[PDB]
Amino acid sequence: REIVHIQAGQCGNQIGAKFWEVISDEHGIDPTGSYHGDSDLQLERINVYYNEATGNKYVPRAILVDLEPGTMDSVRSGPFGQIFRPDNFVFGQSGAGNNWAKGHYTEGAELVDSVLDVVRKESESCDCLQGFQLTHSLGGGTGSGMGTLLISKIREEYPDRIMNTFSVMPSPKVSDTVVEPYNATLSVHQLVENTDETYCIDNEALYDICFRTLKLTTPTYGDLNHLVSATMSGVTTCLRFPGQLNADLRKLAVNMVPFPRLHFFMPGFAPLTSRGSQQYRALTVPELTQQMFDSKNMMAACDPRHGRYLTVAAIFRGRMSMKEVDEQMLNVQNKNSSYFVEWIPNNVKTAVCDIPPRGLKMSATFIGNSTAIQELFKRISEQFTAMFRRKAFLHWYTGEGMDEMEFTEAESNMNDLVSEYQQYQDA
Amino acid sequence: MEVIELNKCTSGQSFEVILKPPSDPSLEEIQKKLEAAEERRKYQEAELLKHLAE
Amino acid sequence: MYTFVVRDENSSVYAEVSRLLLATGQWKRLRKDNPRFNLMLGERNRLPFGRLGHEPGLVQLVNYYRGADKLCRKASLVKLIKTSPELSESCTWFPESYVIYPREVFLAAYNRRREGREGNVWILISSEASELLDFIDEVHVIQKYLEKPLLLEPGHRKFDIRSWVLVDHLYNIYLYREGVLRTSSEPYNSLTNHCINYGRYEEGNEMFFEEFNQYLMDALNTTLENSILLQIKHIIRSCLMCIEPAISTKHLHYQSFQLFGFDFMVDEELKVWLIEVNGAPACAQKLYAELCQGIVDVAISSVFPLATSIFIKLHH
Amino acid sequence: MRECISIHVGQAGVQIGNACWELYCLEHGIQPDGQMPSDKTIGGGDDSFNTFFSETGAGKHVPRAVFVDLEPTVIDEVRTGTYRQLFHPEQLITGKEDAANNYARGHYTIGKEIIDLVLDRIRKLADQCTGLQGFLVFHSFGGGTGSGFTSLLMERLSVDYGKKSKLEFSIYPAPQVSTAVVEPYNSILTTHTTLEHSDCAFMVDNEAIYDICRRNLDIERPTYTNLNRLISQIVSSITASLRFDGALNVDLTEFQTNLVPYPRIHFPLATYAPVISAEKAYHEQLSVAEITNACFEPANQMVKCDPRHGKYMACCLLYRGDVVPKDVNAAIATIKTKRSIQFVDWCPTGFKVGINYQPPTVVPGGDLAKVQRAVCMLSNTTAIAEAWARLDHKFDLMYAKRAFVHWYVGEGMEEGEFSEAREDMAALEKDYEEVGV
Numbered sequence A: 001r002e003i004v005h006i007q008a009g010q011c012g013n014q015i016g017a018k019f020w021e022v023i024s025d026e027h028g029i030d031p032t033g034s035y036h037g038d039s040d041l042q043l044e045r046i047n048v049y050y051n052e053a054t055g056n057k058y059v060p061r062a063i064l065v066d067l068e069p070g071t072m073d074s075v076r077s078g079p080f081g082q083i084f085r086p087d088n089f090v091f092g093q094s095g096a097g098n099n100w101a102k103g104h105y106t107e108g109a110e111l112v113d114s115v116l117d118v119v120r121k122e123s124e125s126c127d128c129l130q131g132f133q134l135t136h137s138l139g140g141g142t143g144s145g146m147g148t149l150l151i152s153k154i155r156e157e158y159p160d161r162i163m164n165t166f167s168v169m170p171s172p173k174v175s176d177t178v179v180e181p182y183n184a185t186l187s188v189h190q191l192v193e194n195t196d197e198t199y200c201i202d203n204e205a206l207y208d209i210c211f212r213t214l215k216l217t218t219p220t221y222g223d224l225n226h227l228v229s230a231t232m233s234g235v236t237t238c239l240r241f242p243g244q245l246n247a248d249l250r251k252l253a254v255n256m257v258p259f260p261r262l263h264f265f266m267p268g269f270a271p272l273t274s275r276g277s278q279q280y281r282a283l284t285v286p287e288l289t290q291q292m293f294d295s296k297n298m299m300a301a302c303d304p305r306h307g308r309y310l311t312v313a314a315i316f317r318g319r320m321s322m323k324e325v326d327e328q329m330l331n332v333q334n335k336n337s338s339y340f341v342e343w344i345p346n347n348v349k350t351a352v353c354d355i356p357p358r359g360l361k362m363s364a365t366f367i368g369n370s371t372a373i374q375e376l377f378k379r380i381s382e383q384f385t386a387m388f389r390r391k392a393f394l395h396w397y398t399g400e401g402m403d404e405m406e407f408t409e410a411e412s413n414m415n416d417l418v419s420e421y422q423q424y425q426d427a
Numbered sequence B: 001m002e003v004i005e006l007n008k009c010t011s012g013q014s015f016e017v018i019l020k021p022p023s024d025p026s027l028e029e030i031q032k033k034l035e036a037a038e039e040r041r042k043y044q045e046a047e048l049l050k051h052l053a054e
Numbered sequence C: 001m002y003t004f005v006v007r008d009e010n011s012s013v014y015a016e017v018s019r020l021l022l023a024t025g026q027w028k029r030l031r032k033d034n035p036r037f038n039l040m041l042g043e044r045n046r047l048p049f050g051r052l053g054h055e056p057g058l059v060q061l062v063n064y065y066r067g068a069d070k071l072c073r074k075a076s077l078v079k080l081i082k083t084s085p086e087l088s089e090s091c092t093w094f095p096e097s098y099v100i101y102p103r104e105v106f107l108a109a110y111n112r113r114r115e116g117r118e119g120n121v122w123i124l125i126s127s128e129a130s131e132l133l134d135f136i137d138e139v140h141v142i143q144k145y146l147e148k149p150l151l152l153e154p155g156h157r158k159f160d161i162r163s164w165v166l167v168d169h170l171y172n173i174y175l176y177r178e179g180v181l182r183t184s185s186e187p188y189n190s191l192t193n194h195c196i197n198y199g200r201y202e203e204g205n206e207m208f209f210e211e212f213n214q215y216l217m218d219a220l221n222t223t224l225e226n227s228i229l230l231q232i233k234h235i236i237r238s239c240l241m242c243i244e245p246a247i248s249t250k251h252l253h254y255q256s257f258q259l260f261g262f263d264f265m266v267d268e269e270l271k272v273w274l275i276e277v278n279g280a281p282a283c284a285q286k287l288y289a290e291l292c293q294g295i296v297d298v299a300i301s302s303v304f305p306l307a308t309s310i311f312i313k314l315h316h
Numbered sequence D: 001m002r003e004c005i006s007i008h009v010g011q012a013g014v015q016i017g018n019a020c021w022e023l024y025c026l027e028h029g030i031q032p033d034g035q036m037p038s039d040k041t042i043g044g045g046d047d048s049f050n051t052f053f054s055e056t057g058a059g060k061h062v063p064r065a066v067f068v069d070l071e072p073t074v075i076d077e078v079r080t081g082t083y084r085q086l087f088h089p090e091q092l093i094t095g096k097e098d099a100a101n102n103y104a105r106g107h108y109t110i111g112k113e114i115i116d117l118v119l120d121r122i123r124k125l126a127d128q129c130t131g132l133q134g135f136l137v138f139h140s141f142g143g144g145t146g147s148g149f150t151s152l153l154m155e156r157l158s159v160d161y162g163k164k165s166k167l168e169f170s171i172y173p174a175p176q177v178s179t180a181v182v183e184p185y186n187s188i189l190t191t192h193t194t195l196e197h198s199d200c201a202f203m204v205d206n207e208a209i210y211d212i213c214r215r216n217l218d219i220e221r222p223t224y225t226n227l228n229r230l231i232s233q234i235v236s237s238i239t240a241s242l243r244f245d246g247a248l249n250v251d252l253t254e255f256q257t258n259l260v261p262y263p264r265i266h267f268p269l270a271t272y273a274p275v276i277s278a279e280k281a282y283h284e285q286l287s288v289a290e291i292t293n294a295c296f297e298p299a300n301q302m303v304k305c306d307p308r309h310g311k312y313m314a315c316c317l318l319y320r321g322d323v324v325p326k327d328v329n330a331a332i333a334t335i336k337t338k339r340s341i342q343f344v345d346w347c348p349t350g351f352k353v354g355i356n357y358q359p360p361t362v363v364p365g366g367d368l369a370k371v372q373r374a375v376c377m378l379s380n381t382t383a384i385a386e387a388w389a390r391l392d393h394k395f396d397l398m399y400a401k402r403a404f405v406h407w408y409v410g411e412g413m414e415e416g417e418f419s420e421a422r423e424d425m426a427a428l429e430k431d432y433e434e435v436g437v
């Protein structure tokens, strides 16, 4: 059951590169693509993210997408640059100028069929393809506009496969341009309708974690991305290592999404780890479980106490007593049963994996489908309307063919999304 | 109380003991149901492809 | 922290108990249909006993014993006493009682005393069988009215005794040391329900145990313990022990405790009789705080602990 | 001699069948290669064990069994396991991608693509039977496959073999060992569609097996292997009468006769004692009376429920080991005095007893210790409806919000089927409540 990974745009390709770096170190694959590890476990589900090449080499099933060549040249120059199949670098030359319209209607339309050709050629060599994985931001142009265009195309060609996104949400604290609330709102309209799971990685939350918790005074994008890559390895641990569950995208979707449009998850990691800073004391299971449910460990800036969990999935990594893990999990649910909806019984699943992530003996990853995520969308909606009530910066978009109507529809669909999440917060 | 119908054999025995007395659809319809679900699934798929064409 | 759910808002007693549990600061009340409770102060009717004790990581207790209704419904109680060997057919402390559905057993015994001139006043109290029997058709229990109740003076008043009994999860039988005496203010003419003058001889038609002891001493030269309470302890114990194999939650996946109200009438010869057993009893206003704290102590906090007694253990 | 065909559907069915067929092979002295020296009639026979195995010209004994999963991972371990030679390749049918915990994907969409091939392999088994009596179908309530493809298969068997009995061994879903939030949906749906097609069903609540494992086997975290070895002990108890000499429950018809007076109420409770840990050093062997009395403790039942607050319509005791009728009737006469055993007014308060002198067989390196005597009681008590009430309440909580419903509609199903199945279950609960009070 193979997955096809796709990273699009500056942010898309940086977090993607960091993801492949991290899981390639997990599976014992070096930069030349050869396996130099010490367990058969590391290969038991290597097919999910890697193809086999002559000489028993492993090549990530990763398509790299941009309208600019810069970032992808950076990827090639990077530590694991040579592991990617060179054919799978698909780039335009003009860029998207942080403009959803350019990504979705003009500059990205030129490029999209080429991307889809590389997708197709990765799918044809797949015994049973489960679905797709996209990494991108929603506040620029390439990742946002062309990423969602690609998601729409892919759903056309592979309608019965799972569409899965890791989507960085824009925040004024970590902001490149004032038009990010526009690019994100348009994007959310697409994601609501063409993805089965979207991990809402909020740049605001990453910044606060880097600042308040890790005591980094001036965090780069590299620090924010260390956090993102940790979370992504954690979320995908079950696909990549064998457990009692035998994990797949479709069953996760079924178990996490009671209503098709409410598929936006808050991720969390524990223990929070600064880049390079070594952690000497392993955590106790009660500690992992309290932290993993802590708001300060959420990658989306929402307060889980402001809403109710519809569904929860948690993944523990390391040598530890599964009895204690059950005890502590049951413990959290029974001590805070207010914040879990009662009309979805047994709505918290827990898996364990023996192999821990690099640097840690004990770790825990958290995937929450909480209605509190409405806060994030409300935030974007506010920022959106503040400009849109004056039609500010709209000329960047109307010049590319877009009309005011499409903006009003996108805004309206997102406000609807907020209303649904609210609807089940009081059910 | 009353032990009845004791049968023995070289593997075991059996008996009753009493204590108190007392005071479908065809293949045609299956294919019809399955094909109706089939049409509903293909119709929703067509609505999707139509939305995408728009 | 412990968790608990209320599902009978009428229960004065368990209103009391939930308020106490909250004010300990170690109990939190949940929404009525949250399954993740430690403790269920449950409904009086159709209590979903099949749903308890299936929550991983949750010790569950409920304030009712599934099956106890067979002691607490007139027809089933009479049935149980007649049919069970522990109660020995006609035992000494139940009035002659019969199930007639809106008949053959009633006539055979009753006409013997209608012929023998011995007082034939069964019970809606009449002496002609047809008069009350045909009237009931407009299930009922037909019981012998004890025509020689105990004289209580000054006033010549008939009365009944309620004792409150708590059975915990271990099947300990606890009798509350304070019983109540529901008096009739109007004299007797050769029904004591407080729902049916009131207040002449004592407050609210409630006479307590210290007072009734002193009356028994001064007037009759005896003790409440010796004259009445021993028979009451014998009846409470025989009843609860008959049904123990049918209702005990010793090896069950959930646990039951229950508060019962035992109703007695004493006759002129100081013999104690069992009127009815009630599964959902209301305490007396003076005694509420003490008895409800006792429930928390011995039924609830015995299972869910934190960090001189008011009961007599009826030993079995 | 009438043959019985075993059908194992989805992951739970396949792994439980594995456990059972290994136990059966130890019991009948059949080797992992299909050879049974015990069998002097070489190449065939009409022996009691031939009910479950057919013979080849090379002396190989071959399960009258078909394994069927919509995805290959589990049946592939059946294909590379200790008992690889046991099964002819055709018997092991596998699909390609599974039902994703969705009743409707297993029943409708993926189901219709494999139903005809399964039915033809089943007919390849049926054509080697001089007198087929029916099928034993192993499956879970909560899986997508085990739920949906099983109800599909059951409907088809009813049409192709309308004169053959069909018995179910059904795994009832428990959150401690759970795999999907929608398992109450799948459970209600498959029960409603399988009911009239199934003559007798033995329910097994994974909760009960789980607690039995923790309490009586001192295993903190039961794996599927533990649960399934125990389950196969009970299954073997229930089917030994079909594989051995005796007079009690000799055909599948007698299971309905002795256990099921009303066709709708066809879910007999199983209770099984003693379950003793192989790691217990000093163990005192329990008497006929101790294990018979254990049969009336809830903590030994395959489904936690309280038989005192129901009525009995039938009761069987299957003993294995050192047991003699005088000791059984002595234990019964003791128990009736001390326990709440009420039958329905229109049934005889009596026990049908079946004894097999050979002690329960245990798989070497297991968790169960050998015992001198064990018993498995099969009682049709209305108290099993407690499980239904639980299931139905969970179903109601979700369905009030149409939570997850869209997953089903999206595979071709209609919301109406949900409400229909639920109404059928409500009927079933009412029938139980009538019989039992």
Ligand SMILES: Nc1nc2c(ncn2[C@@H]2O[C@H](COP(=O)(O)OP(=O)(O)OP(=O)(O)O)[C@@H](O)[C@H]2O)c(=O)[nH]1
Pocket: D009, D010, D011, D012, D013, D015, D016, D070, D098, D099, D100, D101, D102, D106, D140, D141, D142, D143, D144, D145, D146, D147, D171, D172, D173, D174, D177, D178, D179, D180, D183, D206, D209, D224, D227, D228, D231
């Ligand atoms: N006792 C026991 N229960 C099992 C076993 N395997 C799975 N289950 C239970 O089966 C239920 C889910 O059904 P599965 O058999 O796993 O699902 P399936 O038929 O394989 O269906 P899909 O995989 O969805 O196509 C859960 O409630 C599990 O507890 C087993 O080996 N033993």
Ligand SMILES: COc1cc(-c2nccc3[nH]c(-c4cccc5c4ccn5C)nc23)cc(OC)c1OC
Pocket: A235, A236, A237, A238, A239, A245, A246, A247, A248, A249, A251, A252, A255, A256, A311, A312, A313, A314, A315, A346, A347, A348, A349, A350, A351, A367, D178, D179, D180, D181
């Ligand atoms: C693809 O990745 C994964 C897949 C699975 C998974 N796979 C197969 C069957 C499953 N059933 C449930 C499952 C069962 C019951 C309740 C559940 C789930 C999931 C969420 N709630 C509330 N989860 C399942 C699990 C993962 O983490 C726990 C995971 O990692 C993110």
Ligand SMILES: Nc1ncnc2c1ncn2[C@@H]1O[C@H](COP(=O)(O)OP(=O)(O)CP(=O)(O)O)[C@@H](O)[C@H]1O
Pocket: C095, C123, C143, C144, C145, C146, C147, C159, C160, C191, C192, C193, C263, C265, C275, C276, C278
């Ligand atoms: N055999 C008898 N002899 C004398 N009085 C009797 C009697 N049987 C019943 N009574 C009287 O009947 C009154 C009420 O009847 P009963 O005992 O059936 O209900 P109850 O007193 O417990 C109040 P409730 O029914 O509201 O719980 C009692 O107060 C008692 O004085």
Ligand SMILES: Nc1nc2c(ncn2[C@@H]2O[C@H](COP(=O)(O)OP(=O)(O)O)[C@@H](O)[C@H]2O)c(=O)[nH]1
Pocket: A008, A009, A010, A011, A012, A014, A015, A096, A097, A098, A099, A137, A138, A139, A140, A141, A142, A143, A144, A168, A169, A170, A171, A174, A175, A176, A180, A203, A206, A221, A222, A224, A225, A228
């Ligand atoms: N966490 C993180 N966020 C980024 C990174 N690069 C850009 N962003 C965010 O992404 C948005 C700009 O999108 P970008 O990827 O640069 O646009 P694009 O390449 O044209 O699609 C802004 O909201 C940035 O804050 C990165 O490396 N890490």
Ligand SMILES: [Ca+2]
Pocket: D039, D040, D041, D042, D043, D044, D045, D046, D047, D055
């Ligand atoms: Ca032979």
Ligand SMILES: [Mg+2]
Pocket: A010, A140, A176
């Ligand atoms: Mg940029």
Ligand SMILES: [Mg+2]
Pocket: D010, D011, D069, D071, D098, D099, D145
């Ligand atoms: Mg499966």
